[PDB]
From a paper:
Flavin-dependent halogenases are potentially valuable biocatalysts for the regioselective halogenation of aromatic compounds. Flavin-dependent halogenases require an associated reductase to reduce FAD to FADH2, which is then oxidised by the halogenase and O2 to give C4a-hydroperoxyflavin (FAD-OOH). It is then suggested that chloride attacks the distal oxygen atom of FAD-OOH to generate hypochlorous acid (HOCl),22–24 which H-bonds with an active site lysine residue positioning the electrophile in a spatially defined orientation relative to the aromatic substrate. With PrnA, the carboxylic acid and the amino group of the Trp substrate are engaged in a series of hydrogen bonds to tyrosine (Y443 and Y444), glutamate (E450) and phenylalanine (F454) residues; the indole moiety is stacked between aromatic amino acids (H101, F103 and W455), with an hydrogen bond between the indole NH and a backbone carbonyl group (E346).
In light of this, we sought to engineer PrnA to improve its activity and regioselectivity with anthranilic acid through structure-guided mutagenesis. It seems unlikely that anthranilic acid could contact PrnA active site residues Y443, Y444, E450 and F454, as tryptophan does, while remaining proximal to the catalytic side chains of K79 and E346. Consequently, a series of PrnA mutants were produced with selected active site residues mutated to lysine or arginine. It was reasoned that the additional basic amino acid residues might make contact with the carboxylate group of anthranilic acid to enable tighter substrate binding and effect the orientation of anthranilic acid relative to the catalytic active site residues, thus altering the regioselectivity of halogenation. Mutation of the active site tyrosines (Y443 or Y444) to either lysine or arginine had little effect on the relative activity or regioselectivity with 4. However, the mutation E450K not only increased relative activity ca. 8 fold, but also enhanced ortho selectivity producing 93% 3-chloroanthranilate (4b) compared with 84% observed with the wild-type PrnA. Following further mutagenesis PrnA double mutant (E450K/F454K) was found to display a 16-fold increase in activity compared to the wild-type, producing predominantly the para chlorinated product (4a, 54%). In order to rationalise the effects of the selected mutations on the activity of PrnA, X-ray crystal structures for F454K and E450K were determined at 2.4 and 2.3 Å respectively.
Numbering used by the authors:
A (entry chain A), B (entry chain A): 2 to 435, 447 to 517
The structure:
């Protein structure tokens, strides 16, 4: 079986240039790669927060160290997601916030600290879960850096960056290593009798041929959905948000500092993201069209940040769900042309490089053994489903009942059996779980606990086992005190996030 | 909710004393534990090989180091399973053997050495997979120790031991730390209107009461099956063997040495185990009653080892399957009273301490929250199913067609969708996967490859990706050469298994 020789990527967004970079890297020899992107169809223009796997899975694989790509794309640090006004009836006189922190929660004699915390709360302990079980939240309040002045990491973290800059940075990297860039527009996809893609017809009359096609054409899915007619499974019965009004907002970094985390500010009919970096923060009101109008949501967004009726905006709508099959015949969909959940928790770009990782692990020859694509397609479903569960958990758990949108999340969502089971185990007092392993069950006990406890849904009781383990309870107190010590050191030890980034220019 | 106070274990076999030890360990305080065992109903008398998790999960948890319990139970080392006459038509003039080795196979640029080996075999490379991808098989042929004279580990391994001695060793350990032993026989189990166990009536007239009951009564399942009437799911449609004829056989260790591995010698209608230790080896012909008679199988067993018609034997039959629920109301089944697959691959005792681990992780209070047992019961099904897949893979993969029994394994077995999927991925050329994580997918790429390749079922082709990675192919050759070096060092470096064990008395 002859190997793949010519690859064509359709799309010049983040997805296409990640695909181009990764593939040019994975395929040392016998690989000609061409990417074509329409000068007249813009990128989506968002996608600026991430999760920890980005470096280990994507950039490391490219051989691009964190200190090299960060300053090139206005990179900033994301130590958490701060959730604001999610907990219940928004009250401007009450501080309703909680963090979803990255990183592992320690175990004490095989039991997560979360569960010793719950036991204490039962005895009247007032401190919130994440402030007792992690050392860094207080520092986040102080908008400090996730690492020392000298660059030594001090807490688990991901990244923020400029979406357009990232795409451009990879475009340069990829082109430099042999990727052929073509600024042009596909207008016809031709299929042989078998149903495979033979070539693309462009607006300037070019005919592009290839063995393998990567569809990174974004939500229109030029190859996978339209040409190959693979159905998209709409899942707006699982999740309500289908729109966003977004913009970049200037920040007075000198007076207000740079927050080392993404913020999720709950709204009337959705929520608003805040992704800070030097000079400004990306922002966007994610909402459901069925509970508010774009006009109405736009006014809410402008009001939230005190913006003016002249502020140019990025109006977006998106589909929620996944292709029935991500890879069909000789076409692999990657990016918005494949699956999407709303930007809560930031899984979009992870879907890109996780899919690319799976693609290489299932790489075909020109005979396109269906066993390979089927195995690939099944991994995508798992990856997507795991995240859909976690995202959904932010919603049907809410105690907010003040608008139709929150009522609908409370009562009207379709839930997978998988999330039902986890919730049932959680409520019973049981701990949840504590790359290939990461792609696998990426969201652990700690993550679900940050969310559930932040939202004010606690288990029915502490673990029955703990009543037999007074020693263990004692050791846990020691671990709590230790955490409290580290928290204090960091306060006087970490530079401000603002100052640290500036020291990176 | 009041905690559990009184626990009664029924059964004095390996299962009961593992339960008693583990529980007395896990439950520091507020735990009274009584074990009752009928002097007139003997233990099963087998169960003498194990897998690597035994130490980390069971003995370590007890605080009993390997050097302390081994000499107490005639412990020996198990570095592998050697399979003899499994490959095809048995021919006394052909050496048909292969090893299933414990331990991980190295990865080269994210691809297991197994797959680089396959690529070489395609070019005419003659050496067998396990001799190229692991350093220790040749040493096993030489019956060497898995560690240096001084006791430094040199290869991954599990253990062999005397079944009765192990049970007795734990009995002493457990009794010494507060377990109450009662030599007596349960004759009636009394249930309240709710259907929970109130107490046990013994033959001497004792009435035993408790909050929690552990059923370790072996295959009769005195509590779970008979009293509580939980159905046992027969799975002799998944696996054919239902009987064994066993005995201990003296060995001339001075002239023949001690093999550092379990042997699996395929027979006409089953297979025969060889579990060596100092002085003798446990052995047993596992067979299907539907393809040979006990009388016939007995004669085959005696002939295999040159035994005499006077040799006293352990005649066994066993059920294959699992309880519909391992834990029902206030009764947890552990051991042969719960699930069993035939002894191929040695999962029996693993089922014991893995279940005990899950029991403590789901430990109840006296209200017996059904969410706990349901979560427990589901983990048991996963554990069992994963092993049933792996065991089944030894059979429907066989190329032997010389008896009805092998024909039946070839064509007539009921296969899970899970094993079908793995096989399909394997055949396509894809790698398979590479405690809580162990219980999870304990059988990895290497294990399945040892088995499949030993049995002579290879993938349809090498990984398409490798054609683009000449560099990677090169590095793999280096790794192969390195493995060959270590193999040579061990040959001149390891003491004989026989000599090493003797140095332990
Ligand atoms: C509101 C919103 C918020 C998000 N927030 C996050 C986040 O916080 N974190 C995160 O990781 N992800 C996020 N995502 C997802 C993320 O934005 C995308 O995964 C990422 O930006 C890559 O998108 P893309 O390249 O597939 O699509 P696009 O940006 O839409 O790129 C499409 C490309 O295909 C080209 N193209 C299309 N059609 C044709 C044609 N017929 N001929 C030629 N060329 C063509 C276009 O010109 C363009 O270059 C968010 C998405 C949305 C919608
Ligand atoms: C042929 C064969 C080979 C095996 N090989 C292996 C192997 O290689 N590796 C491995 O790990 N496992 C193996 N196993 C499994 C292993 O033998 C068992 O898991 C282990 O020995 C524990 O068994 P048990 O204690 O549950 O049952 P048993 O040994 O049958 O113990 C039963 C106990 O319950 C008591 N009892 C019963 N009934 C009553 C009553 N009404 N009143 C009072 N008391 C009572 C009995 O007196 C006895 O003490 C094998 C099993 C078989 C059958
Ligand atoms: Cl996202
Ligand atoms: Cl077994």
């Amino acid at each position: 079986n002859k190997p793949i020789k010519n690859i064509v990527i359709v799309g010049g967004g983040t997805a296409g240039w990640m695909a181009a970079s990764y593939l040019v890297r994975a395929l040392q020899q016998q690989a000609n790669i061409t990417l074509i992107e329409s000068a007249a169809i813009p990128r989506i223009g968002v996608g600026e927060a991430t999760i920890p796997s980005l470096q280990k899975v994507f950039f490391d694989f490219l051989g691009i160290p964190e200190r090299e790509w960060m300053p090139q794309v206005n990179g900033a640090f994301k130590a958490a997601i701060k959730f604001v006004n999610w907990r219940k009836s928004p009250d401007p006189s009450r501080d309703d916030h909680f963090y979803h922190l990255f990183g592992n929660v320690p175990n004490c004699d095989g039991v997560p600290l979360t569960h010793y915390w719950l036991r204490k709360r039962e005895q009247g302990f007032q401190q919130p879960m994440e402030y007792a079980c992690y050392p860094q939240p207080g520092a986040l309040d102080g908008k400090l850096a996730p690492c020392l002045s000298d660059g030594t990491r001090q807490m688990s973290h991901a990244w923020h960056f400029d979406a357009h800059l990232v795409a451009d940075f990879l475009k340069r990297w990829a082109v430099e290593r042999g990727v052929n860039r073509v600024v042009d527009e596909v207008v016809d996809v031709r299929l042989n009798n078998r149903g495979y893609i033979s070539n693309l017809l462009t607006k300037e009359g070019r005919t592009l041929e290839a063995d393998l096609f990567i569809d990174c054409s974004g939500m229109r899915g030029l190859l996978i959905n339209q040409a190959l007619k693979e159905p998209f499974i709409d899942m707006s019965d699982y999740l309500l948000c289908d729109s966003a009004v977004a913009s970049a907002v200037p920040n007075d970094d000198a007076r207000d500092g740079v927050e080392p985390y993404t913020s999720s500010i709950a709204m009337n009919s959705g929520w608003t993201w805040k992704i800070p970096m030097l000079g400004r923060f990306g922002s966007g009101y994610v909402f459901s069209s069925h509970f508010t109008s774009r006009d109405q949501a736009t006014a809410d967004f402008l009001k939230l940040w005190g913006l003016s009726d002249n502020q140019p905006l990025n109006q977006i709508k998106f589909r929620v769900g996944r292709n029935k099959r991500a890879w069909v015949n000789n076409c692999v969909s990657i990016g918005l042309s494949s699956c999407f959940l709303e930007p809560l928790e930031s899984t979009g770009i992870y879907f890109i490089y996780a899919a690319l990782y799976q693609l290489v692990k299932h790489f075909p020859d020109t005979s396109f053994d269906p066993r390979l694509s089927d195995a690939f397609n099944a991994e995508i479903v798992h990856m997507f489903d795991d995240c859909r569960d976690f995202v959904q958990a932010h919603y049907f758990t809410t105690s907010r009942d003040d608008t139709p949108f929150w009522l609908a999340n409370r009562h009207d969502l379709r839930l997978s059996d998988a999330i039902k089971e986890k919730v049932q185990r959680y409520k019973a007092g049981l701990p949840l779980t504590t790359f290939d392993y990461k792609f696998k069950n990426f969201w652990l006990n700690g993550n679900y606990y940050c969310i559930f406890a932040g939202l004010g849904m606690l288990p029915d009781r502490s673990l029955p086992l703990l009543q037999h383990r007074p020693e263990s309870i004692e050791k846990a107190e020691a671990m709590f005190a230790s955490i409290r010590r580290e928290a204090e050191r960091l306060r006087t030890s970490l530079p401000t996030n603002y100052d640290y980034l500036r020291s990176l220019r």
